[PDB]
Amino acid sequence: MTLRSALLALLSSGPLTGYDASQRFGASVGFVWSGSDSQIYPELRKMEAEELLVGSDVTEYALSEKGWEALRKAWYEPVTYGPTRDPARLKAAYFEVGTNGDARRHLRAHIAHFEQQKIQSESMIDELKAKTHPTLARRLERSPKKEHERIVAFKVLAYEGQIARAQAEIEWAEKGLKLLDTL
Amino acid sequence: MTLRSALLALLSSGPLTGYDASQRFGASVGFVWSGSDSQIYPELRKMEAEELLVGSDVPWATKTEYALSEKGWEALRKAWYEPVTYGPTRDPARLKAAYFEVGTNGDARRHLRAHIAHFEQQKIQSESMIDELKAKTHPTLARRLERSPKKEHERIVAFKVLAYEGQIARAQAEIEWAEKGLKLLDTL
Ligand SMILES: COc1cc(C(=O)[O-])ccc1O
Ligand SMILES: COc1cc(C(=O)[O-])ccc1O
C-alpha cells in the first residue's frame, strides 16, 4: 500500500517505463521508502490492472485520473505509524550477550553508518536546491511555477529529517560508548 | 532471521510457553523489534524443529514450554557477534512530508502535528519503561535477573536502559524536525 503510494508520487513527476521507474525510484523517493526492482515491477503491473495507471507503448506508465485521485486520497489520510523494527536498538538492548569490545564495534559501526547517511542527505539537498536532481527537474518542468518553491522545500524537509534522525543516532551511540567506559 | 534473534534474546530470560512468550515479547523487546502473535508462534515452532529450543509439555490442557538448548545459546551468541545489517529506510512520515505539495499547507500542518503527538507519546512510554527497568520490576527483566549472576545485573539493566534512551533520542529528533517543518509551513 505504501509502496503503491510512493510509486504514485514518483509517477506524478511524469510517465516512466518500469525499468526507468525502478532506476529513478532508487535515486529519489527510495531513500525514504525503499523499493527494489522485484517489488516495483509487479506493483506497477497491479496498478495498471486496477486502472490507476495507463500503459502506452514506447510499457510506459502514466497516472490515470483514478491514479491522481488515489494519490490525493493517500496523502490526505493520516499517517499510520507502524511498530518499531530497529536492528541496532535490538542489538544494543542485549549488548550483555557479547563483550564490551563487541558493543563498541557495534556502536562505532552505527556512527559510521549514520555519518555516511548525513553526507548522502546533504548532497541530495544540494542537488534539490540546484534544481538539477533528474526526477525533481522533470517534476518542476511539469508543475505550475507558483508550486516550485513548495515542491523543492518539501523534498528538502524530508532530507533534513533524515539528517535529524542521523544526528540523534550518532549522539546516542556516542553516549553508549561513554557508558561502556563504566560498565 | 532478526525475529528469531529477538526471540532467542527473550527466551534467555527463561523458558516460556508460546502464549506467555507472545505477551512478554510485546511488553519488552517488541518495543524495539516488533513481533505479532502470528509471527511469533510459527517462528518458535521452527526454532524447536531446528533444535535451537527444547519443547517441554507443561500443565497450563498441556502447552509447550520453550527453553534454549545449547545450540540456541550458541545461535544467540553468534547472532550478537555479527555486525548489524542496516536495512533500507521505509519511513511513512518522511514519505508523506516529501510530497506535502500533493495537499494543502493545512493538511501538512495536520500531519506534522500528528507526528509530534505520536513521538511525544512514545517518549512517555520509553521513559516509563526506563523507570520500570531501573526499579528492576519489569516482568521480563525480573525473570532475567533471577536467572543471572549478581555480578552481571547492573550491566544487564544498563543495556536495556540504553536501548530506550535511544528510542527517546530518536523521538526527540522527530519532534524537533516536525517543529521546524511547522515553522517552514508558516512561510510557504
Ligand atoms: C523523495 O525524494 C525525492 C523525490 C523527488 C521527486 O519526486 O521529485 C526528487 C528527489 C528526491 O530525492
Ligand atoms: C528490550 O526491551 C526489554 C527487554 C527486557 C529483557 O529482555 O529483559 C526487559 C524489558 C524490556 O523493555
Author numbering:
A (entry chain A): 1 to 58, 68 to 192
B (entry chain B): 1 to 60, 66 to 67, 67A, 68 to 192
Which passages does the manuscript contain on this structure?
VanR belongs to the PadR family of regulatory proteins and has been proved to specifically respond to its effetor vanillic acid, a hydroxytyrosol analog. In C. glutamicum, VanR regulates the expression of the vanABK operon, which is responsible for the catabolism of vanillic acid. In the absence of vanillic acid, the VanR protein binds to a 28-bp operator sequence downstream of +1 position of the PvanABK promoter and represses the transcription of the vanABK operon. When vanillic acid is present, it binds to the VanR protein, inducing a conformational change which releases the promoter DNA, thus activating the operon transcription.
To facilitate VanR engineering, we determined the crystal structure of VanR complexed with vanillic acid. VanR functions as a homodimer and each monomer consists of an N-terminal winged helix-turn-helix (wHTH) domain which interacts with operator DNA, and a C-terminal homodimerization domain. Electronic densities of vanillic acids were found in the interface of two subunits. Vanillic acid binds to a hydrophobic interdomain pocket formed by V29, Y168, M133, L145, and H142 from subunit A and Y103 of subunit B. Besides hydrophobic interaction, polar contacts largely contribute to the recognition of vanillic acid by VanR. Specifically, the carboxyl group of vanillic acid is electrostatically stabilized by salt bridges with R148 of subunit A and by hydrogen bond with the side chain of Y103 of subunit B. Furthermore, the hydroxyl and methoxyl groups on the benzene ring of vanillic acid form two hydrogen bonds with the side chains from Y168 of subunit A. Those three residues were highly conserved in different bacteria, suggesting they are essential for ligand recognition. To alter the effector specificity of VanR, amino acid residues Y103, R148, and Y168, were chosen for simultaneous site-saturation mutagenesis. The sequencing results revealed amino acid substitutions (Y103L, R148L and Y168M) in HyT12. The crystal structure of the regulatory protein VanR from C. glutamicum complexed with its inducer was elucidated based on which a hydroxytyrosol biosensor was developed by altering the induction specificity of VanR.
